[PDB]
Ligand binder design. Structure first.
Ligand SMILES: COc1ccccc1[C@H]1OCCCN(C(=O)N2CCC(CC(=O)O)CC2)CC(=O)N(CC(C)(C)C)c2ccc(Cl)cc21
Length: 335
């Protein structure tokens, strides 16, 4: 390995932690192509996230990010974010980008271009409708699922349908993203960020921050349950997506985050703690899920068990209760 690729893998371990090993297990050319795509997305995200960067400066950065991949000397030195290293040493990452086969370069660059356009569109605004929530999620997460899918097909380890079915790929990203947004309500609040859609929360309270106040906890949990019900709608696509994967290392790569999100939604369902702190999967729980998620029958079993759990916990007066029951029944009767 070149020294620049070794630095890339060190950044991957710093950023993706226990998940780095799963990326490192990808077969053949998929390994480096995913590692670089991961780091490049980490850099894009770090620009997006950084509230110290003015909108005037951020819009060009987001729009032009795809171009920076091709600019050997391009770097960014003024990020105050946690993963600022991937921006300060972007030349190391971009060099390795430009060492990839062109069929992978072109995927990554197109995705970065489209994601940057969409991230720049949401700088001013908060998410209003459920449709806008899916648009925002497409830009920051659905397009990641689409890009990855295209690397798998372009590498020929998976059938072309995997790369072409953008809707199923998009759902893979939306499932994770909505789960993260649902779970991270409070830390986002404290960070001054709002991602829960205004059209759902405004039916319960006057301001999104009101869910942190004790007197509104019942209303908060109802909205939580409603948003969780929303996220569960992606699971049929997730099952379809995963069912098509023929390469073991790709399967594990794609399946592990999905079953972690399933378990996360089940922990968060009807859970007041979402509003008081960070609800997390026990490490031992996470490890077993990661070890088990290696074939369709096992992943389906895991989905069904957690959905049955949610199902038995649905409160009769929950405002979404029949919607929750219906999507769980749909999921259960597919495979
Ligand atoms: C669409 O997403 C897919 C699709 C297929 C496969 C993988 C992903 C996804 O990875 C999920 C697991 C790793 N993620 C992560 O950062 N960690 C942090 C450390 C944690 C473990 C730990 O702390 O030890 C695990 C979770 C990255 C991530 O969440 N996303 C998903 C979105 C874009 C919603 C944020 C991500 C980003 C880039 C790529 Cl290339 C993949 C992904």
């Amino acid at each position: 390995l070149s020294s620049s690729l070794k630095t890339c893998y060190k950044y991957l371990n710093q950023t993706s932690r226990s998940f780095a090993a799963v990326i490192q297990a990808l077969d053949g050319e998929m390994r480096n192509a995913v590692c670089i795509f991961y780091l490049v997305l980490r850099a894009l995200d770090t620009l997006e996230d950084d509230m110290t960067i003015s909108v005037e400066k951020k819009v060009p950065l987001l729009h032009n990010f795809h171009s920076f991949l091709y600019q050997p000397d391009w770097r960014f030195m003024e990020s105050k974010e946690k993963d600022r290293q991937v921006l300060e040493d972007f030349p190391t990452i971009s060099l390795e980008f430009r060492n990839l086969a062109e069929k992978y370069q072109t995927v990554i660059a197109d995705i970065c271009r489209r994601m940057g356009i969409g991230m720049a569109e949401f700088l001013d605004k908060h998410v209003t409708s459920e449709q806008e929530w899916d648009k925002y999620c497409h830009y920051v997460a659905g397009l990641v699922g689409i890009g990855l899918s295209r690397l798998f097909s372009a590498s020929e380890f998976e059938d072309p349908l995997v790369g072409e079915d953008t809707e199923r790929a998009n759902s893979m990203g939306l499932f994770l993203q909505k789960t993260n947004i649902i779970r991270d309500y409070l830390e986002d609040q404290q960070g001054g960020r709002e991602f829960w859609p205004q059209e759902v929360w405004s039916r319960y309270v006057k301001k999104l921050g009101d869910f942190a106040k004790p007197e509104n906890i019942d209303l908060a949990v109802q909205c939580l349950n409603e948003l969780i019900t929303n996220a569960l709608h992606h699971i049929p696509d997730v099952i379809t997506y995963l069912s098509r994967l023929r390469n073991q290392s790709v399967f594990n790569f794609c399946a592990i985050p999905q079953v972690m999100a399933i378990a996360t939604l089940a922990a968060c369902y009807n859970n007041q703690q979402v509003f008081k702190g960070a609800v997390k999967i026990r490490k031992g729980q996470a490890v077993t899920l990661m070890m088990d998620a290696t074939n369709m029958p096992a992943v389906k079993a895991i989905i069904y068990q957690y959905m049955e759990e949610i199902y038995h916990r649905i409160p009769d007066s929950d405002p979404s209760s029949s919607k929750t029951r219906q999507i769980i029944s749909t999921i259960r009767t597919q495979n």
